[PDB]
Amino acid sequence: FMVSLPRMVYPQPKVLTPCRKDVLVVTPWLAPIVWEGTFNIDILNEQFRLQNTTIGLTVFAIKKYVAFLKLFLETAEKHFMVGHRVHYYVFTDQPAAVPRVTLGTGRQLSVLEVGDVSMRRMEMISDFCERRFLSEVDYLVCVDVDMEFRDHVGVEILTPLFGTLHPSFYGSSREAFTYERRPQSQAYIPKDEGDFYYMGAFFGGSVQEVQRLTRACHQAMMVDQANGIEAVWHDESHLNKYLLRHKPTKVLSPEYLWDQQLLGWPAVLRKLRFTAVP
Numbered sequence: 001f002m003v004s005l006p007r008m009v010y011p012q013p014k015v016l017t018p019c020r021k022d023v024l025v026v027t028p029w030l031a032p033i034v035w036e037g038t039f040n041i042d043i044l045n046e047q048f049r050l051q052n053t054t055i056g057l058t059v060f061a062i063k064k065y066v067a068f069l070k071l072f073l074e075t076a077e078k079h080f081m082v083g084h085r086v087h088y089y090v091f092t093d094q095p096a097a098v099p100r101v102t103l104g105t106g107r108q109l110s111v112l113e114v115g116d117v118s119m120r121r122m123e124m125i126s127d128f129c130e131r132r133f134l135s136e137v138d139y140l141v142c143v144d145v146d147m148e149f150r151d152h153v154g155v156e157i158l159t160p161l162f163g164t165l166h167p168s169f170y171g172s173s174r175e176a177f178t179y180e181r182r183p184q185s186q187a188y189i190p191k192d193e194g195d196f197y198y199m200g201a202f203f204g205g206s207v208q209e210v211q212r213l214t215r216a217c218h219q220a221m222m223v224d225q226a227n228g229i230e231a232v233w234h235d236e237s238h239l240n241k242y243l244l245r246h247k248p249t250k251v252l253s254p255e256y257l258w259d260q261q262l263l264g265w266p267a268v269l270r271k272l273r274f275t276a277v278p
Contacts, residue, residue: 005046022268027195027251031159035253036270039156045083048155054085055158056137056207060121061092061145062114068145068277070099077104079149079273087137091124118234119221126214133207141204143274151255151273159250161205161213163198163243167254167263172197180237185229186220187237189244198243200236202257202274205249213242 019025019037026032057080061069069090080086088109090098095111103109112129114120125133125142133140139158169177174194180187204210217238224231231237255269259276 002047003050005043005050008042008046010040010042023253027247029247031247031249031251033165033251033253034156034256036255041152041154041156044155048084048158051138052085053139053155053158054087054137055081055155056087056089056133056140058089058091058125058140058142059145060114060124061090061094061098063093065145066092066094066097068147069097070101071148071277072145073099073101073109075149077101077107079151080153081155084155089129091121118230119218119225122214122218122221122235122238126211126218130211133211137207139204140207140210142202142210144201146277147201147274148277149274151271153256153273157204157250157252157256159205159248161209161243161246161248162203162250162252163196163239163248164202164252164257165254166197166199167258169197170254177240178233179240180231180233182229184227185231185237186223187231187241189241194240194244195247196243196251198236198240198248198251199257200233200239202252203239213239213246216242 020035023035024033025035025038032038057076059072073088082104086107089112090109091112091114092098093114095113098111101109114124125140175191177194177197179189179194179197182188203213205213217235220238220241221235255271255273257274258269258272260272261276261278265272
């Protein structure tokens, strides 16, 4: 049950004036593609605060990658879901190397020690943490640690299932996508199929839908292992196969996953929200 929004004063949307004319803002299956200028964050914050939404953020920091946690978490505090309830889940082989980061109110962090490497992430989310996440958060966001937040990443992304456009391929034709192309792999996608190339470094959704995705990807990876094949881009190849056959309900633009050193700052990006660390 959703209570009424309060009165709000904001600019009238005009149906004969598009928000953005330079980019596709809706997929052919009627999922929004999230770009700056397409959303009124005040309306969305209201909607999600009225539901007391809790967002889980999962991040794996193994071996030397623990060094990236401090900047990752400190910038998440500045930019990720500020004002909402957040639970960080940090999966690491070095619990003592997790930095002591000061959190805003309503935010918490859990250190989860981990003890196959290629499969670990999908396995952890779908098998080991299944009951935990269902009990503790409404949405799960799965990101890589060697990143920093530079601008707003908020409830505009929340939806039952989302993927993010890989920054290297958003302008590419589908035959150029680095999908798995060997029919012997469960991740196989033929040259005449594909909507987008989604990056494995930022996906999420409701807990239920993220567990469905990660369970399917884990099962598919196990099949490939039994058949002696490893998909070209590992769990990202399987993520792409899953999101081809199970369409995401929102798609995030490359504002949400960018490498400025590699790709600069194109006109089409009004904000660089979440970026690779040089």
